[PDB]
PDB file of all heavy atoms in Angstrom:
ATOM      1  N   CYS R  36     101.243 268.082 197.259  1.00  0.00           N
ATOM      2  CA  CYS R  36     101.929 266.834 196.992  1.00  0.00           C
ATOM      3  C   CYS R  36     101.937 265.965 198.247  1.00  0.00           C
ATOM      4  O   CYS R  36     102.281 266.429 199.340  1.00  0.00           O
ATOM      5  CB  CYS R  36     103.342 267.125 196.519  1.00  0.00           C
ATOM      6  SG  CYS R  36     104.304 265.671 196.237  1.00  0.00           S
ATOM      7  N   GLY R  37     101.526 264.704 198.098  1.00  0.00           N
ATOM      8  CA  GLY R  37     101.529 263.831 199.254  1.00  0.00           C
ATOM      9  C   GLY R  37     102.904 263.373 199.683  1.00  0.00           C
ATOM     10  O   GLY R  37     103.025 262.743 200.739  1.00  0.00           O
ATOM     11  N   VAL R  38     103.938 263.676 198.897  1.00  0.00           N
ATOM     12  CA  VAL R  38     105.294 263.235 199.192  1.00  0.00           C
ATOM     13  C   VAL R  38     106.123 264.343 199.837  1.00  0.00           C
ATOM     14  O   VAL R  38     106.625 264.177 200.953  1.00  0.00           O
ATOM     15  CB  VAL R  38     105.980 262.726 197.919  1.00  0.00           C
ATOM     16  CG1 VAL R  38     107.409 262.359 198.227  1.00  0.00           C
ATOM     17  CG2 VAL R  38     105.230 261.511 197.393  1.00  0.00           C
ATOM     18  N   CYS R  39     106.288 265.466 199.138  1.00  0.00           N
ATOM     19  CA  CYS R  39     107.100 266.574 199.639  1.00  0.00           C
ATOM     20  C   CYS R  39     106.300 267.620 200.395  1.00  0.00           C
ATOM     21  O   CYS R  39     106.894 268.522 200.997  1.00  0.00           O
ATOM     22  CB  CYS R  39     107.839 267.264 198.491  1.00  0.00           C
ATOM     23  SG  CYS R  39     106.808 268.274 197.377  1.00  0.00           S
ATOM     24  N   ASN R  40     104.979 267.542 200.339  1.00  0.00           N
ATOM     25  CA  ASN R  40     104.058 268.403 201.066  1.00  0.00           C
ATOM     26  C   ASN R  40     104.140 269.861 200.623  1.00  0.00           C
ATOM     27  O   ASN R  40     103.628 270.745 201.315  1.00  0.00           O
ATOM     28  CB  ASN R  40     104.257 268.275 202.583  1.00  0.00           C
ATOM     29  CG  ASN R  40     103.905 266.875 203.096  1.00  0.00           C
ATOM     30  OD1 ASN R  40     104.776 266.141 203.562  1.00  0.00           O
ATOM     31  ND2 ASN R  40     102.638 266.482 202.947  1.00  0.00           N
ATOM     32  N   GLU R  41     104.728 270.134 199.458  1.00  0.00           N
ATOM     33  CA  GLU R  41     104.627 271.462 198.874  1.00  0.00           C
ATOM     34  C   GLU R  41     103.371 271.559 198.015  1.00  0.00           C
ATOM     35  O   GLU R  41     102.854 270.554 197.517  1.00  0.00           O
ATOM     36  CB  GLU R  41     105.853 271.790 198.019  1.00  0.00           C
ATOM     37  CG  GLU R  41     107.206 271.718 198.729  1.00  0.00           C
ATOM     38  CD  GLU R  41     107.396 272.763 199.812  1.00  0.00           C
ATOM     39  OE1 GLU R  41     106.488 273.601 200.027  1.00  0.00           O
ATOM     40  OE2 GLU R  41     108.493 272.769 200.420  1.00  0.00           O
ATOM     41  N   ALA R  42     102.880 272.785 197.860  1.00  0.00           N
ATOM     42  CA  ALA R  42     101.653 273.073 197.135  1.00  0.00           C
ATOM     43  C   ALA R  42     101.954 273.530 195.711  1.00  0.00           C
ATOM     44  O   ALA R  42     102.919 274.267 195.467  1.00  0.00           O
ATOM     45  CB  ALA R  42     100.844 274.144 197.873  1.00  0.00           C
ATOM     46  N   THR R  43     101.119 273.077 194.778  1.00  0.00           N
ATOM     47  CA  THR R  43     101.162 273.440 193.373  1.00  0.00           C
ATOM     48  C   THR R  43      99.826 274.055 192.980  1.00  0.00           C
ATOM     49  O   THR R  43      98.774 273.428 193.194  1.00  0.00           O
ATOM     50  CB  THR R  43     101.430 272.212 192.492  1.00  0.00           C
ATOM     51  OG1 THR R  43     102.776 271.766 192.682  1.00  0.00           O
ATOM     52  CG2 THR R  43     101.223 272.566 191.027  1.00  0.00           C
ATOM     53  N   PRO R  44      99.810 275.250 192.403  1.00  0.00           N
ATOM     54  CA  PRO R  44      98.538 275.836 191.975  1.00  0.00           C
ATOM     55  C   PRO R  44      98.036 275.161 190.712  1.00  0.00           C
ATOM     56  O   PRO R  44      98.803 274.870 189.792  1.00  0.00           O
ATOM     57  CB  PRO R  44      98.886 277.306 191.718  1.00  0.00           C
ATOM     58  CG  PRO R  44     100.360 277.334 191.499  1.00  0.00           C
ATOM     59  CD  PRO R  44     100.963 276.137 192.160  1.00  0.00           C
ATOM     60  N   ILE R  45      96.733 274.896 190.684  1.00  0.00           N
ATOM     61  CA  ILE R  45      96.075 274.363 189.500  1.00  0.00           C
ATOM     62  C   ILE R  45      95.031 275.314 188.935  1.00  0.00           C
ATOM     63  O   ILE R  45      94.447 275.019 187.887  1.00  0.00           O
ATOM     64  CB  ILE R  45      95.463 272.974 189.773  1.00  0.00           C
ATOM     65  CG1 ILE R  45      94.436 273.025 190.903  1.00  0.00           C
ATOM     66  CG2 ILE R  45      96.556 271.976 190.108  1.00  0.00           C
ATOM     67  CD1 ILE R  45      93.503 271.816 190.914  1.00  0.00           C
ATOM     68  N   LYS R  46      94.786 276.450 189.586  1.00  0.00           N
ATOM     69  CA  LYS R  46      94.001 277.536 189.019  1.00  0.00           C
ATOM     70  C   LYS R  46      94.863 278.787 188.920  1.00  0.00           C
ATOM     71  O   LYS R  46      95.864 278.930 189.628  1.00  0.00           O
ATOM     72  CB  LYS R  46      92.758 277.848 189.862  1.00  0.00           C
ATOM     73  CG  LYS R  46      92.004 276.623 190.338  1.00  0.00           C
ATOM     74  CD  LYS R  46      90.506 276.870 190.387  1.00  0.00           C
ATOM     75  CE  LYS R  46      89.789 276.097 189.285  1.00  0.00           C
ATOM     76  NZ  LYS R  46      89.947 274.621 189.446  1.00  0.00           N
ATOM     77  N   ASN R  47      94.462 279.695 188.028  1.00  0.00           N
ATOM     78  CA  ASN R  47      95.078 281.013 187.978  1.00  0.00           C
ATOM     79  C   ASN R  47      94.963 281.699 189.332  1.00  0.00           C
ATOM     80  O   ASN R  47      93.994 281.508 190.071  1.00  0.00           O
ATOM     81  CB  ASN R  47      94.421 281.887 186.907  1.00  0.00           C
ATOM     82  CG  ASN R  47      94.705 281.410 185.502  1.00  0.00           C
ATOM     83  OD1 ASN R  47      95.706 280.737 185.252  1.00  0.00           O
ATOM     84  ND2 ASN R  47      93.825 281.760 184.571  1.00  0.00           N
ATOM     85  N   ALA R  48      95.977 282.497 189.660  1.00  0.00           N
ATOM     86  CA  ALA R  48      95.974 283.281 190.886  1.00  0.00           C
ATOM     87  C   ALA R  48      94.731 284.166 190.899  1.00  0.00           C
ATOM     88  O   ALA R  48      94.200 284.485 189.828  1.00  0.00           O
ATOM     89  CB  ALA R  48      97.259 284.112 190.981  1.00  0.00           C
ATOM     90  N   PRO R  49      94.226 284.564 192.066  1.00  0.00           N
ATOM     91  CA  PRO R  49      93.063 285.463 192.098  1.00  0.00           C
ATOM     92  C   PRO R  49      93.390 286.780 191.416  1.00  0.00           C
ATOM     93  O   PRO R  49      94.572 287.123 191.261  1.00  0.00           O
ATOM     94  CB  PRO R  49      92.787 285.656 193.601  1.00  0.00           C
ATOM     95  CG  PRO R  49      93.836 284.909 194.343  1.00  0.00           C
ATOM     96  CD  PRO R  49      94.857 284.401 193.387  1.00  0.00           C
ATOM     97  N   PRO R  50      92.382 287.542 190.981  1.00  0.00           N
ATOM     98  CA  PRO R  50      92.673 288.749 190.198  1.00  0.00           C
ATOM     99  C   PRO R  50      93.515 289.734 190.994  1.00  0.00           C
ATOM    100  O   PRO R  50      93.320 289.922 192.195  1.00  0.00           O
ATOM    101  CB  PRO R  50      91.285 289.316 189.864  1.00  0.00           C
ATOM    102  CG  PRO R  50      90.288 288.324 190.380  1.00  0.00           C
ATOM    103  CD  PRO R  50      90.973 287.490 191.402  1.00  0.00           C
ATOM    104  N   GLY R  51      94.477 290.344 190.307  1.00  0.00           N
ATOM    105  CA  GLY R  51      95.450 291.204 190.938  1.00  0.00           C
ATOM    106  C   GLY R  51      96.611 290.490 191.593  1.00  0.00           C
ATOM    107  O   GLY R  51      97.526 291.161 192.090  1.00  0.00           O
ATOM    108  N   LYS R  52      96.621 289.160 191.601  1.00  0.00           N
ATOM    109  CA  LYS R  52      97.606 288.400 192.351  1.00  0.00           C
ATOM    110  C   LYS R  52      98.467 287.569 191.410  1.00  0.00           C
ATOM    111  O   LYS R  52      98.146 287.376 190.233  1.00  0.00           O
ATOM    112  CB  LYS R  52      96.922 287.488 193.373  1.00  0.00           C
ATOM    113  CG  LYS R  52      96.172 288.242 194.449  1.00  0.00           C
ATOM    114  CD  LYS R  52      97.090 288.722 195.548  1.00  0.00           C
ATOM    115  CE  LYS R  52      96.597 288.225 196.890  1.00  0.00           C
ATOM    116  NZ  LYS R  52      95.596 289.169 197.470  1.00  0.00           N
ATOM    117  N   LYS R  53      99.575 287.070 191.957  1.00  0.00           N
ATOM    118  CA  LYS R  53     100.463 286.170 191.237  1.00  0.00           C
ATOM    119  C   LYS R  53     101.101 285.214 192.234  1.00  0.00           C
ATOM    120  O   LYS R  53     101.251 285.539 193.413  1.00  0.00           O
ATOM    121  CB  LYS R  53     101.540 286.934 190.455  1.00  0.00           C
ATOM    122  CG  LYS R  53     102.372 287.914 191.276  1.00  0.00           C
ATOM    123  CD  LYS R  53     103.494 288.508 190.417  1.00  0.00           C
ATOM    124  CE  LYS R  53     104.705 288.915 191.243  1.00  0.00           C
ATOM    125  NZ  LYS R  53     104.836 290.401 191.375  1.00  0.00           N
ATOM    126  N   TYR R  54     101.439 284.019 191.754  1.00  0.00           N
ATOM    127  CA  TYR R  54     102.152 283.031 192.551  1.00  0.00           C
ATOM    128  C   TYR R  54     103.652 283.209 192.364  1.00  0.00           C
ATOM    129  O   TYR R  54     104.121 283.519 191.263  1.00  0.00           O
ATOM    130  CB  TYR R  54     101.754 281.609 192.149  1.00  0.00           C
ATOM    131  CG  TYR R  54     100.330 281.252 192.491  1.00  0.00           C
ATOM    132  CD1 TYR R  54      99.414 280.974 191.494  1.00  0.00           C
ATOM    133  CD2 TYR R  54      99.896 281.227 193.807  1.00  0.00           C
ATOM    134  CE1 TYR R  54      98.097 280.654 191.800  1.00  0.00           C
ATOM    135  CE2 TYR R  54      98.580 280.911 194.122  1.00  0.00           C
ATOM    136  CZ  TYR R  54      97.690 280.628 193.109  1.00  0.00           C
ATOM    137  OH  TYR R  54      96.382 280.315 193.397  1.00  0.00           O
ATOM    138  N   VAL R  55     104.397 283.008 193.449  1.00  0.00           N
ATOM    139  CA  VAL R  55     105.853 282.982 193.433  1.00  0.00           C
ATOM    140  C   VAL R  55     106.301 281.794 194.269  1.00  0.00           C
ATOM    141  O   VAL R  55     105.805 281.587 195.380  1.00  0.00           O
ATOM    142  CB  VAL R  55     106.461 284.285 193.985  1.00  0.00           C
ATOM    143  CG1 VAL R  55     107.979 284.159 194.106  1.00  0.00           C
ATOM    144  CG2 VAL R  55     106.104 285.455 193.088  1.00  0.00           C
ATOM    145  N   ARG R  56     107.225 281.012 193.735  1.00  0.00           N
ATOM    146  CA  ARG R  56     107.828 279.885 194.435  1.00  0.00           C
ATOM    147  C   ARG R  56     109.137 280.325 195.073  1.00  0.00           C
ATOM    148  O   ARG R  56     110.083 280.668 194.357  1.00  0.00           O
ATOM    149  CB  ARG R  56     108.073 278.754 193.436  1.00  0.00           C
ATOM    150  CG  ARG R  56     108.747 277.506 193.937  1.00  0.00           C
ATOM    151  CD  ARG R  56     107.810 276.655 194.659  1.00  0.00           C
ATOM    152  NE  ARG R  56     106.855 275.972 193.785  1.00  0.00           N
ATOM    153  CZ  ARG R  56     105.840 275.274 194.276  1.00  0.00           C
ATOM    154  NH1 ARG R  56     105.694 275.115 195.578  1.00  0.00           N
ATOM    155  NH2 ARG R  56     104.929 274.774 193.446  1.00  0.00           N
ATOM    156  N   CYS R  57     109.193 280.321 196.410  1.00  0.00           N
ATOM    157  CA  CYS R  57     110.446 280.636 197.083  1.00  0.00           C
ATOM    158  C   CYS R  57     111.521 279.603 196.737  1.00  0.00           C
ATOM    159  O   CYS R  57     111.216 278.441 196.463  1.00  0.00           O
ATOM    160  CB  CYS R  57     110.246 280.679 198.603  1.00  0.00           C
ATOM    161  SG  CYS R  57     111.747 281.154 199.533  1.00  0.00           S
ATOM    162  N   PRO R  58     112.801 279.993 196.755  1.00  0.00           N
ATOM    163  CA  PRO R  58     113.859 278.987 196.600  1.00  0.00           C
ATOM    164  C   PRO R  58     113.826 277.871 197.646  1.00  0.00           C
ATOM    165  O   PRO R  58     114.409 276.811 197.390  1.00  0.00           O
ATOM    166  CB  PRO R  58     115.150 279.815 196.690  1.00  0.00           C
ATOM    167  CG  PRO R  58     114.760 281.168 196.174  1.00  0.00           C
ATOM    168  CD  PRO R  58     113.300 281.364 196.586  1.00  0.00           C
ATOM    169  N   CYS R  59     113.159 278.051 198.797  1.00  0.00           N
ATOM    170  CA  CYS R  59     112.998 276.947 199.738  1.00  0.00           C
ATOM    171  C   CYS R  59     111.882 276.000 199.313  1.00  0.00           C
ATOM    172  O   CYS R  59     111.677 274.985 199.985  1.00  0.00           O
ATOM    173  CB  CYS R  59     112.698 277.445 201.160  1.00  0.00           C
ATOM    174  SG  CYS R  59     110.995 277.983 201.396  1.00  0.00           S
ATOM    175  N   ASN R  60     111.165 276.346 198.240  1.00  0.00           N
ATOM    176  CA  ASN R  60     110.054 275.654 197.589  1.00  0.00           C
ATOM    177  C   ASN R  60     108.690 276.057 198.138  1.00  0.00           C
ATOM    178  O   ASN R  60     107.687 275.532 197.657  1.00  0.00           O
ATOM    179  CB  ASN R  60     110.203 274.130 197.648  1.00  0.00           C
ATOM    180  CG  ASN R  60     111.384 273.661 196.852  1.00  0.00           C
ATOM    181  OD1 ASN R  60     111.661 274.191 195.776  1.00  0.00           O
ATOM    182  ND2 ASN R  60     112.116 272.696 197.383  1.00  0.00           N
ATOM    183  N   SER R  61     108.607 276.980 199.092  1.00  0.00           N
ATOM    184  CA  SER R  61     107.298 277.415 199.566  1.00  0.00           C
ATOM    185  C   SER R  61     106.535 278.132 198.453  1.00  0.00           C
ATOM    186  O   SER R  61     107.087 278.982 197.755  1.00  0.00           O
ATOM    187  CB  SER R  61     107.445 278.342 200.768  1.00  0.00           C
ATOM    188  OG  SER R  61     106.170 278.819 201.148  1.00  0.00           O
ATOM    189  N   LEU R  62     105.259 277.791 198.278  1.00  0.00           N
ATOM    190  CA  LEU R  62     104.412 278.545 197.365  1.00  0.00           C
ATOM    191  C   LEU R  62     103.943 279.831 198.040  1.00  0.00           C
ATOM    192  O   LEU R  62     103.339 279.789 199.118  1.00  0.00           O
ATOM    193  CB  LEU R  62     103.205 277.718 196.938  1.00  0.00           C
ATOM    194  CG  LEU R  62     102.272 278.422 195.952  1.00  0.00           C
ATOM    195  CD1 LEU R  62     103.001 278.665 194.601  1.00  0.00           C
ATOM    196  CD2 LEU R  62     101.010 277.599 195.728  1.00  0.00           C
ATOM    197  N   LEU R  63     104.195 280.973 197.400  1.00  0.00           N
ATOM    198  CA  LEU R  63     103.830 282.277 197.932  1.00  0.00           C
ATOM    199  C   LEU R  63     102.828 282.947 197.009  1.00  0.00           C
ATOM    200  O   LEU R  63     102.758 282.655 195.813  1.00  0.00           O
ATOM    201  CB  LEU R  63     105.054 283.194 198.096  1.00  0.00           C
ATOM    202  CG  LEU R  63     106.223 282.561 198.837  1.00  0.00           C
ATOM    203  CD1 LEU R  63     107.429 283.495 198.825  1.00  0.00           C
ATOM    204  CD2 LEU R  63     105.829 282.212 200.263  1.00  0.00           C
ATOM    205  N   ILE R  64     102.055 283.862 197.578  1.00  0.00           N
ATOM    206  CA  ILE R  64     101.084 284.632 196.818  1.00  0.00           C
ATOM    207  C   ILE R  64     101.349 286.114 197.052  1.00  0.00           C
ATOM    208  O   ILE R  64     101.512 286.551 198.197  1.00  0.00           O
ATOM    209  CB  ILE R  64      99.638 284.222 197.174  1.00  0.00           C
ATOM    210  CG1 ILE R  64      98.667 284.697 196.099  1.00  0.00           C
ATOM    211  CG2 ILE R  64      99.236 284.660 198.580  1.00  0.00           C
ATOM    212  CD1 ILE R  64      97.286 284.074 196.213  1.00  0.00           C
ATOM    213  N   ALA R  65     101.450 286.871 195.963  1.00  0.00           N
ATOM    214  CA  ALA R  65     101.797 288.282 196.010  1.00  0.00           C
ATOM    215  C   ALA R  65     100.865 289.065 195.101  1.00  0.00           C
ATOM    216  O   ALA R  65     100.239 288.511 194.194  1.00  0.00           O
ATOM    217  CB  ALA R  65     103.254 288.528 195.582  1.00  0.00           C
ATOM    218  N   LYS R  66     100.777 290.369 195.349  1.00  0.00           N
ATOM    219  CA  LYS R  66     100.064 291.242 194.434  1.00  0.00           C
ATOM    220  C   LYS R  66     100.908 291.429 193.182  1.00  0.00           C
ATOM    221  O   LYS R  66     102.138 291.501 193.256  1.00  0.00           O
ATOM    222  CB  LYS R  66      99.756 292.587 195.098  1.00  0.00           C
ATOM    223  CG  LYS R  66      99.514 292.474 196.602  1.00  0.00           C
ATOM    224  CD  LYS R  66      99.230 293.821 197.256  1.00  0.00           C
ATOM    225  CE  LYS R  66      97.920 293.777 198.041  1.00  0.00           C
ATOM    226  NZ  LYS R  66      96.905 294.755 197.552  1.00  0.00           N
ATOM    227  N   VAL R  67     100.244 291.483 192.024  1.00  0.00           N
ATOM    228  CA  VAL R  67     100.968 291.592 190.760  1.00  0.00           C
ATOM    229  C   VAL R  67     101.843 292.837 190.741  1.00  0.00           C
ATOM    230  O   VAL R  67     102.864 292.872 190.045  1.00  0.00           O
ATOM    231  CB  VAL R  67      99.979 291.579 189.576  1.00  0.00           C
ATOM    232  CG1 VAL R  67      98.923 292.663 189.746  1.00  0.00           C
ATOM    233  CG2 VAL R  67     100.698 291.697 188.239  1.00  0.00           C
ATOM    234  N   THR R  68     101.486 293.853 191.527  1.00  0.00           N
ATOM    235  CA  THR R  68     102.230 295.103 191.580  1.00  0.00           C
ATOM    236  C   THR R  68     103.427 295.058 192.524  1.00  0.00           C
ATOM    237  O   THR R  68     104.201 296.021 192.559  1.00  0.00           O
ATOM    238  CB  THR R  68     101.290 296.234 192.004  1.00  0.00           C
ATOM    239  OG1 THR R  68     100.710 295.921 193.277  1.00  0.00           O
ATOM    240  CG2 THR R  68     100.171 296.397 190.989  1.00  0.00           C
ATOM    241  N   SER R  69     103.607 293.975 193.278  1.00  0.00           N
ATOM    242  CA  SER R  69     104.634 293.925 194.310  1.00  0.00           C
ATOM    243  C   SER R  69     106.020 293.752 193.702  1.00  0.00           C
ATOM    244  O   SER R  69     106.233 292.885 192.847  1.00  0.00           O
ATOM    245  CB  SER R  69     104.353 292.781 195.283  1.00  0.00           C
ATOM    246  OG  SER R  69     103.164 293.016 196.017  1.00  0.00           O
ATOM    247  N   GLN R  70     106.969 294.569 194.157  1.00  0.00           N
ATOM    248  CA  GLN R  70     108.352 294.398 193.743  1.00  0.00           C
ATOM    249  C   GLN R  70     109.063 293.333 194.565  1.00  0.00           C
ATOM    250  O   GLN R  70     110.042 292.751 194.086  1.00  0.00           O
ATOM    251  CB  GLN R  70     109.109 295.729 193.849  1.00  0.00           C
ATOM    252  CG  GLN R  70     110.582 295.677 193.414  1.00  0.00           C
ATOM    253  CD  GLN R  70     111.544 295.253 194.520  1.00  0.00           C
ATOM    254  OE1 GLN R  70     111.295 295.486 195.706  1.00  0.00           O
ATOM    255  NE2 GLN R  70     112.634 294.600 194.134  1.00  0.00           N
ATOM    256  N   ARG R  71     108.589 293.056 195.781  1.00  0.00           N
ATOM    257  CA  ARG R  71     109.287 292.128 196.655  1.00  0.00           C
ATOM    258  C   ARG R  71     108.293 291.426 197.562  1.00  0.00           C
ATOM    259  O   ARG R  71     107.234 291.965 197.899  1.00  0.00           O
ATOM    260  CB  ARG R  71     110.373 292.820 197.500  1.00  0.00           C
ATOM    261  CG  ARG R  71     109.892 294.010 198.313  1.00  0.00           C
ATOM    262  CD  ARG R  71     110.996 294.561 199.224  1.00  0.00           C
ATOM    263  NE  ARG R  71     112.321 294.393 198.642  1.00  0.00           N
ATOM    264  CZ  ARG R  71     113.434 294.161 199.329  1.00  0.00           C
ATOM    265  NH1 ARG R  71     113.447 294.142 200.651  1.00  0.00           N
ATOM    266  NH2 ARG R  71     114.569 293.956 198.671  1.00  0.00           N
ATOM    267  N   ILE R  72     108.651 290.204 197.941  1.00  0.00           N
ATOM    268  CA  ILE R  72     107.852 289.384 198.838  1.00  0.00           C
ATOM    269  C   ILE R  72     108.809 288.633 199.750  1.00  0.00           C
ATOM    270  O   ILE R  72     109.948 288.337 199.377  1.00  0.00           O
ATOM    271  CB  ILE R  72     106.925 288.416 198.065  1.00  0.00           C
ATOM    272  CG1 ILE R  72     106.063 287.599 199.033  1.00  0.00           C
ATOM    273  CG2 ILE R  72     107.741 287.511 197.159  1.00  0.00           C
ATOM    274  CD1 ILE R  72     104.627 287.468 198.638  1.00  0.00           C
ATOM    275  N   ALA R  73     108.349 288.356 200.965  1.00  0.00           N
ATOM    276  CA  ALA R  73     109.135 287.644 201.957  1.00  0.00           C
ATOM    277  C   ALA R  73     108.543 286.268 202.197  1.00  0.00           C
ATOM    278  O   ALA R  73     107.321 286.116 202.312  1.00  0.00           O
ATOM    279  CB  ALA R  73     109.197 288.412 203.280  1.00  0.00           C
ATOM    280  N   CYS R  74     109.412 285.277 202.272  1.00  0.00           N
ATOM    281  CA  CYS R  74     108.981 283.934 202.636  1.00  0.00           C
ATOM    282  C   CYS R  74     108.659 283.877 204.126  1.00  0.00           C
ATOM    283  O   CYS R  74     109.437 284.381 204.944  1.00  0.00           O
ATOM    284  CB  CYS R  74     110.053 282.913 202.300  1.00  0.00           C
ATOM    285  SG  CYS R  74     109.567 281.245 202.738  1.00  0.00           S
ATOM    286  N   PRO R  75     107.534 283.276 204.513  1.00  0.00           N
ATOM    287  CA  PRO R  75     107.158 283.248 205.926  1.00  0.00           C
ATOM    288  C   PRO R  75     107.809 282.132 206.730  1.00  0.00           C
ATOM    289  O   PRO R  75     107.726 282.167 207.963  1.00  0.00           O
ATOM    290  CB  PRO R  75     105.636 283.050 205.856  1.00  0.00           C
ATOM    291  CG  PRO R  75     105.385 282.315 204.610  1.00  0.00           C
ATOM    292  CD  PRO R  75     106.465 282.765 203.639  1.00  0.00           C
ATOM    293  N   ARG R  76     108.417 281.131 206.094  1.00  0.00           N
ATOM    294  CA  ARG R  76     109.018 280.024 206.830  1.00  0.00           C
ATOM    295  C   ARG R  76     110.149 280.521 207.715  1.00  0.00           C
ATOM    296  O   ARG R  76     111.089 281.154 207.216  1.00  0.00           O
ATOM    297  CB  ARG R  76     109.540 278.947 205.886  1.00  0.00           C
ATOM    298  CG  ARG R  76     108.463 278.402 204.981  1.00  0.00           C
ATOM    299  CD  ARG R  76     108.897 277.102 204.300  1.00  0.00           C
ATOM    300  NE  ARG R  76     107.749 276.389 203.755  1.00  0.00           N
ATOM    301  CZ  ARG R  76     107.790 275.525 202.751  1.00  0.00           C
ATOM    302  NH1 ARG R  76     108.914 275.273 202.093  1.00  0.00           N
ATOM    303  NH2 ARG R  76     106.670 274.891 202.399  1.00  0.00           N
ATOM    304  N   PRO R  77     110.093 280.278 209.026  1.00  0.00           N
ATOM    305  CA  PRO R  77     111.111 280.854 209.920  1.00  0.00           C
ATOM    306  C   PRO R  77     112.532 280.412 209.610  1.00  0.00           C
ATOM    307  O   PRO R  77     113.463 281.179 209.875  1.00  0.00           O
ATOM    308  CB  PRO R  77     110.678 280.377 211.319  1.00  0.00           C
ATOM    309  CG  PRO R  77     109.408 279.641 211.155  1.00  0.00           C
ATOM    310  CD  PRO R  77     108.937 279.711 209.747  1.00  0.00           C
TER     311      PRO R  77
END
């Protein structure tokens, strides 16, 4: 987005993967098997 600078996926996640949107709005990528993921924004 040219306004908020957050990313939106327009293709399916790569095989074995899934997208997760952090509550801070960061787009994250995780393995479909993952129970948990950490946001990298400090």
Side-chain angles (χ1 to χ4, degrees):
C36 177
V38 176
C39 72
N40 295 114
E41 303 294 358
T43 290
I45 59 162
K46 316 215 109 63
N47 291 336
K52 296 278 235 273
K53 54 174 208 253
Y54 292 116
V55 173
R56 177 79 73 188
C57 183
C59 77
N60 294 321
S61 176
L62 181 65
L63 310 174
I64 198 167
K66 328 179 126 240
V67 55
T68 58
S69 294
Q70 181 274 331
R71 54 175 32 214
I72 182 136
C74 180
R76 303 194 163 155

